[PDB]
What we know:
Number of domains of chain B: 2
Oligomer: heterotrimer
CATH architecture of the largest domain in chain B: Sandwich
Entry title: Crystal structure of the autoimmune MHC class II I-Au complexed with myelin basic protein 1-11 at 2.2A
Shape of chain A: rod-shaped
CATH superfamily of the largest domain in chain B: Immunoglobulins
Helix content of chain B: 10-25%
Radius of gyration of chain B: 25 Å
Number of helices of chain B: 1
PDB class: immune system
Chain A: Myelin Basic Protein peptide with 8 residue linker peptide
Structural class of chain B: alpha+beta
Order of helices and strands of chain B: EEEEHEEEEEEEEE
CATH topology of the largest domain in chain B: Immunoglobulin-like
Number of strands of chain B: 13
Keywords: MHC class II, I-Au, H-2u, autoimmune disease, unique register, experimental autoimmune encephalomyelitis, myelin basic protein, immune system
Assembly: trimeric
Distance between the termini of chain B: 62 Å
Bound molecules: 2-acetamido-2-deoxy-beta-D-glucopyranose
Amino acid sequence: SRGGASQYRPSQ
Amino acid sequence: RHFVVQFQPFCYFTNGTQRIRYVTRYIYNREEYLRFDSDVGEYRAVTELGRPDAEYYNKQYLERTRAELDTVCRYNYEETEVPTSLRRLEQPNVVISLSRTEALNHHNTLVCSVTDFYPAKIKVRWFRNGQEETVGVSSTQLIRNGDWTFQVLVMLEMTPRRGEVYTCHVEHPSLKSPITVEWRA
Amino acid sequence: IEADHVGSYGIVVYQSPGDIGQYTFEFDGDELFYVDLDKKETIWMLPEFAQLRSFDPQGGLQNIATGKHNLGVLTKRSNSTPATNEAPQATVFPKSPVLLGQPNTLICFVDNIFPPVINITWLRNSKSVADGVYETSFFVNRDYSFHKLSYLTFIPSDDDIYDCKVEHWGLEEPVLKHWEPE
Ligand SMILES: *[C@@H]1O[C@H](CO)[C@@H](O)[C@H](O)[C@H]1NC(C)=O
Ligand SMILES: *[C@@H]1O[C@H](CO)[C@@H](O)[C@H](O)[C@H]1NC(C)=O
Ligand SMILES: *[C@H]1O[C@H](CO)[C@@H](O)[C@H](O)[C@H]1NC(C)=O
């Protein structure tokens, strides 16, 4: 049902 | 002056959800520097700007990233695309026109305009009095209208002559039976 | 890279100055939606798709916040290297064959856009047109530049001239791609 996004990961 | 970052995630599908290749790019201005490739199953640096992040991402969320290849990619495909993008059908409109004003032996050019279809898969063929023209045919590359429809123009070099019938033949997944549009001298 | 399909679920672009960000979902090169950051709303290109699927705009805001975080963190790590401007490329063409009196749409394709900030407008008979205009978000390219499209609905007539006006830092003078019913 609910689409999912690809987490944009934060650096240091 | 201006500075930018870009995060471009790609779920590459092949034969349904079989050969799924989940990738994830990290960009600065117009240059990539970090990447998660399902094929390598791990992060790697593409340019200097990435060395400082490598080990960090692998330690912080690799278990989470690999996980998305199924909670994002595979899931979206089988859960959201299947009933939307992969189901969407738009029948092409097929019209024939002549580049120059009609005449009886002057060489002109028939143009078969095939528009507003989706998906991109299409086949267009020209026929003269019933047989496949295999000489002066040419066509534009498939054009993407940016609104979820495509168009393509297929030209035929010719010379109008009475009694002659030219047909533009078109097959598309949206079509139960092919489309044929005739044009006569 | 070859494939039968390609889905980009969560493209983030974050620029400065301006805190200018875009969040989009693409599938096979077409735009599923972009999230309106000011309205906190997922705007679908094909409204009917929203009946069979969804996306919490929260996702966009979060990922954009990361874009904010990574820009700068990356800007310094690069000794503040500025983005080199590119010169856009515009081409105009109609959605379907032109027939006098039959509503149609002019498409202005603008490629090689970098950075992702630009002005695309339409001129009818050399005078400004605001009504019947629509445009897409910035699509990603292979060379990491962008392309975008603007649409003008119009009624074909014998004596009519249209231009697509594009403005970019990359251009010294605003490019005008002119078009008329041939
Ligand atoms: C996958 O799709 C490609 C392109 O349609 C095709 O060549 C191949 O036979 C299909 N099957 C495989 C190998 O997964
Ligand atoms: C973009 O073009 C329009 C066309 O009239 C202009 O009014 C505007 O000032 C330009 N850029 C912006 C939004 O400042
Ligand atoms: C920029 O200068 C800093 C200062 O030492 C250096 O550490 C860094 O590697 C340089 N990066 C680039 C290529 O701008």
